[PDB]
Design a protein around this ligand. Structure first.
Ligand SMILES: *Cc1c(COP(=O)(O)O)cnc(C)c1O
Ligand SMILES: *Cc1c(COP(=O)(O)O)cnc(C)c1O
Lengths: 464, 466
């Protein structure tokens, strides 16, 4: 009749032309650019197929033991499988650790941990945004509470030294005695080094606070064994299932379960599960949990372990190649997948550079460097190797890359001379758009990057 | 070269055999059962293909105007398209309404509004859980603050008349005068009737509170024009993009923008507060594939085919009501203005607890709910039945008459085990007797073998074999 209603069978490319091209376009913008954004990566066809399944269609509100609905014989099979793969892939005795796989992304998971362990107005210490922390580790101004984490809990930042780039731990341990936090966060969004979880545990225990690691950026490296495991000192560990773990967007919270002390058990499990549900979320996204389960399988495999070993080495290559060209790397080096490039040695800033490199189809982002005084004119560049390593690039290809980046910095500087010394940014950006002189080089530099990029592959479903 | 590690091109059926079967099993459990859970539905292949795309791979932190990263020409094209489809599908002048499209789901969308407009410890009022409200509308008891809504904010509930099953608006107006809510919630999870948004606006205004509608359950019906629009009285309206809108799991927040009232003249400020609460306040990077699906689902929602499916959904409900009323069941408000009904199983001598399980075992899905009059949330007397999911598989009035009949058989059966169980018997007992007795297991198998035969006669929306 009008029961043409089986438009439900109709495929996207025919149902929504507008959305189809957008996908076809983006997936192409990916194939030709160089992704150096540390938090980016490319999920496998496998993980990606799970997201489109009919598991979207099931409401499984509660947990595998206790659910609020019924046709859940399979969603329980699934969620359990995922919890088991998670604890396995990080090699955790389930008689010591548990895992919640329901958080929707990194952020919710973090939050849910605060709700659970810290309470409304309890204190949190996180590394400052400019010194390398995340928005969810608290973030204020003398005027406003930006991040929900500073709106509902009382937060305080601990900073890195402004000459080493290193977290000043003697400071943290001194202020924590004065601030009295209920939880210390150990995790970063832009830090080249391994965190001393051992010392942090000391500081936490001396205050009767929980040590929480947010290993979102290094989760992949930790599965492989490349960087040291946080699990040895922390009571809780949250993580995205997608930055270097290379899954789809989701989050997990790992918590300790078992014994704790003199003459007493952990209670972490029930508090954290409750906070995620019914505390904060609604029905779990089962297709998401599927992809996470898939990605955890692939992560245990030795092919992942090699990709993760490649990732770090690709970073040492890129560092050296740039060091050799006169660039300063912030802590002098890196223990993992990223580097903080200080562009003050080349006479420019990360604000300007970021834009010129962007126009050349090279992606990265600006970041403040330890010493900076003005988050308005940031001096750094955050470069990471995960996404490009997933497309195959081995060291020699990254030397190729270091060179393109260099050209781009040279380019940004030409525009910084030809712009004037008291030049606003709206200007610099204007001149990069209108001046034909410049457009020529930019266009040339780009035509050169995309072709280099098209050589390696782009993971994903049929073409996209 | 271990660099043959391109296990990244390798398909699921080959890469994860364990998860493949789990998907193949569930998608099958779906084809043979009768889904009567009101919040469930089946998304189209179209909406479902968008979820698997490369859009997953992009980080687009900020908003279309100001993002924090760069390769976003397309994500902006997309997010805008979605915002436009949304305002369009509900027929809203974009000079009067804006839409945030990044909530990861209904729950977080509500939380963001409360975070933006009510602030920490600000007062909120919503319908009580057992009276048909939703968890996120606040939920607390004598000992614990259970929902996060009632942890960070201070909530107090309003209830339905227990002799009528209708919201008692008189009490809500009285109580609001003493409680001073900063925001009143107008939305339900299990309510057969239209909410008088008009009167709720008059109570909100009298108190200088915001009227927020959470139309999650009825969003589909509202796009078709079946039930009346909340948009005519509320300052903000949140909704899932998946209950009766039939999309993927995500959420949206609609807010007023323009001039709110004059002395000069003061504008709404709703937009910037809301947007900021969503980001960078609460969430991280948007899920672009999810947004793609929502955009797809909204285009399908404007089409007259959706409008006909939505008109069918309501009628299928009237069919299911009557068929059941005719068998002696008491429908809670006596009827329904939408997609669901709250069945009172006290007239058949049993409860929602036991029934739910028997019907479950017979491949018939629904869930228990307290009825207005109930005193014991462990002994709920009701059944929430909804028509959306089965209407998406084609069932018409007449098919629902046979459904009504299967449900009936199942209640008769639950009663057989309740009698053959003893009166002072426990749910652990009832559930175990339903499992060990072959006497019972026979009927159950027979009734099940019969439901599946019936369900298989209908299509099941979804992408290929998965
Ligand atoms: C289900 C529902 C929600 C919550 O959505 P989730 O996607 O489960 O987080 C919010 N409001 C109402 C009215 C609902 O029925
Ligand atoms: C990116 C990131 C997150 C947040 O993940 P979203 O999905 O973007 O919410 C959390 N923690 C750290 C340390 C991160 O880098």
């Amino acid at each position: 009749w009008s029961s043409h209603e089986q438009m439900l069978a109709q495929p996207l490319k025919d149902s929504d032309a507008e959305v189809y091209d957008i996908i076809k376009k983006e997936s192409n913008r990916q194939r030709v650019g160089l992704e150096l954004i540390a938090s980016e990566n490319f999920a496998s066809r496998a993980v990606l197929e799970a997201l489109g399944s009919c598991l979207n269609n099931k409401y499984s509100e509660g947990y595998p033991g206790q659910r609020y609905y019924g046709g859940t014989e399979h969603i329980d099979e699934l969620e359990t499988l995922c919890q088991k793969r998670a604890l396995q892939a990080y090699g955790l005795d389930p008689q010591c650790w548990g895992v919640n796989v329901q958080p929707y992304s990194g952020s919710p998971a973090n939050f849910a941990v605060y709700t659970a362990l810290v309470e409304p107005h309890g204190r949190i210490m996180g590394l400052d945004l400019p010194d390398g922390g995340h928005l969810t580790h608290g973030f204020m101004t003398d005027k406003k509470k930006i991040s929900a984490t500073s709106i509902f809990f009382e937060s305080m930042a601990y900073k890195v030294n402004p000459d080493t780039g290193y977290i000043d731990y003697d400071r943290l341990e001194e202020n924590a005695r004065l601030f009295h936090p209920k939880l210390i966060i150990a995790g970063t969004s832009c830090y080249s080094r391994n965190l001393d979880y051992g010392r942090l545990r000391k500081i936490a225990d001396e205050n009767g606070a929980y040590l929480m690691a947010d290993m979102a950026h290094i989760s992949g490296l930790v599965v492989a064994g490349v960087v040291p495991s946080p699990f040895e000192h922390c009571h809780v560990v949250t993580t995205t299932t997608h930055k270097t773990l290379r899954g789809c967007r989701a989050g997990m919270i790992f918590y300790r379960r078992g014994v704790r002390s003199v003459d007493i058990l952990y209670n972490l499990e029930s508090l954290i599960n409750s906070a995620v549900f019914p505390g904060l979320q609604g029905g779990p996204h089962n297709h998401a949990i599927a992809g996470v389960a898939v990605a955890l399988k692939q992560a245990m495999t030795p092919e992942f372990k090699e990709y993760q070993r490649q990732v770090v080495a690709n970073c040492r290559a890129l560092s050296a190649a740039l060091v050799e060209l006169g660039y300063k790397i912030v802590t002098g080096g890196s223990d993992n997948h990223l580097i903080l490039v200080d562009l003050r040695s080349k006479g420019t800033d990360g604000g300007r550079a970021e834009k010129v490199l962007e126009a050349c189809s090279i992606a990265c982002n600006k970041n403040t460097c330890p010493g900076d005084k003005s988050a308005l004119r940031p001096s750094g560049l955050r470069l990471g190797t995960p996404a490009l390593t997933s497309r195959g690039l081995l060291e020699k290809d990254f030397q190729k890359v270091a060179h393109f980046i260099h050209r781009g910095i040279e380019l940004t500087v030409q525009i910084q001379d030809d712009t004037g010394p008291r030049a606003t940014l709206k200007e610099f950006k204007e001149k990069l758009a209108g001046d034909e002189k410049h457009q020529r080089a930019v266009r040339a530099l780009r035509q050169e990057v995309e072709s280099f990029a098209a050589l390696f592959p782009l993971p994903g479903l049929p073409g996209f």
